[PDB]
């Protein structure tokens, strides 16, 4: 039973870490490109901002799914009931 708990902890760590790494890389690239676009012309700063928010709505979907699943695994445990 201890091996199951340890592997569940490792699984949660992987779920959170990979999602955080991907989200950070994607948001860094998006922010750099948004800064370049804003520096190109300040008259479209607000609208473009909304657009990048739209990109965020697609950027971190699976990452939040993994974070939620890891939070469900840390406290609740469907694997323990399966023996």
């Amino acid at each position: 039973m201890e091996t199951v708990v340890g592997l569940t902890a490792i699984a949660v760590a992987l779920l959170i870490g990979l999602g955080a790494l991907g989200t950070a890389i994607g948001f860094g690239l998006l922010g750099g490109k948004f800064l370049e676009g804003a520096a190109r012309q300040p008259e479209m700063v607000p609208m473009l901002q909304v657009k990048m928010f739209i990109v965020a709505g697609l950027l971190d979907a699976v990452t939040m799914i993994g974070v939620g699943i890891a939070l469900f695994f840390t406290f609740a445990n469907p694997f323990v009931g399966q023996i």
């Binding site: 965020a56 697609l58 979907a61 699943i69 406290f75 609740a76």
Partner: protein, 286 residues
């Protein structure tokens, strides 16, 4: 009571299903709910969704049955602003004469926003009011309907069914199968075009199946993560210490400030994706 038990109680829904003796009763334990088969209903999710939809429809009908057409009132100005925003969003993607896209997009957006707004209220206020009103100390009650994957799955299934129905209506089984198997790779030779159907079929089927799954799962995961973070922040206050509850309160303020924006963004993304997917049904992009 322990924190794990509190989380487990907050993670369980109210289930109505076929009891071992009689098809009339509510499950009292999680194992009993798991015993229920596919023919079970989540009373709280359906009730909250129906109540919010009815409230939205009544509010929008109040400002539509007596349209002044001149100087607008307080409620009708807000209704007109949202209607204009929805029309502008629709007209920028869909160029056809379909009269169903705009009302459907407006309904989806407002209904999702209302379903998400209820998550902002304190995690224990509504579950504890239901328990007092009912008189039970172990009643299960989840107010946030979007944390239940069933609602998002049903919305995605209905959107997919509408997409398929519209594509069929506009292309016949002819163009439907032609887009499914004979596009985007085509060849004049009979043998080559016969050998090219597996890749096209795989690509089109995979994308078509993956659309509603992603549409539902994005919202499902986002709101599940938000609700789990809120429940965990409640456990932070559960300790009872002095120096810890203030950090918990600050974290709650930050999480709510982020979560209102996330709530708006998820609804906007879902509405835009539904509009784009419906627009993709009527023309060929291949």
């Amino acid at each position: 009571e322990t924190a794990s038990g509190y989380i487990q109680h907050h993670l369980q829904n109210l289930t109505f299903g076929r009891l071992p003796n009689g098809d009339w009763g509510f499950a009292h334990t999680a194992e009993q709910a798991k015993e229920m088969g596919f023919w079970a209903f989540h009373v709280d999710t359906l009730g909250w969704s129906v109540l919010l939809g009815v409230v939205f429809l009544f509010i929008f009908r109040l400002a539509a049955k007596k349209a002044t057409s001149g100087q607008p009132g307080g409620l009708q100005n807000f209704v007109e602003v949202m209607v204009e925003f929805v029309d502008t969003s629709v007209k920028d993607t869909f160029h056809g004469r379909n009269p169903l896209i705009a009302p459907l997009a407006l309904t989806v957006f407002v209904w999702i926003f209302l379903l998400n707004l209820i998550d902002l209220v304190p995690v224990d206020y509504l579950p504890m009011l239901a328990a007092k009103i009912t008189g039970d100390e172990h009643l299960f009650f989840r107010a946030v309907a979007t944390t239940d994957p069933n609602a998002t799955l049903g919305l995605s299934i209905s959107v997919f069914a509408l997409i398929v129905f519209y594509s069929i209506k506009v292309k016949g089984i002819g163009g439907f199968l032609g887009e499914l198997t004979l596009h985007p790779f085509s060849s004049k030779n009979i043998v080559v075009q016969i050998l090219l159907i597996p890749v096209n079929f795989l690509l089109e089927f995979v994308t078509l199946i993956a659309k509603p799954v992603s549409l539902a799962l994005r919202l499902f995961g986002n709101m599940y993560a938000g609700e789990l973070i809120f429940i965990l922040i409640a456990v932070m206050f559960g300790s009872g210490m002095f120096l810890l509850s203030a950090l918990g309160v600050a974290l709650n303020w930050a999480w709510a400030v982020f979560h209102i924006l996330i709530i708006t963004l998820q609804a906007f993304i879902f509405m835009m994706l539904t509009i784009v997917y419906l627009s993709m049904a009527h023309e060929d992009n291949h």
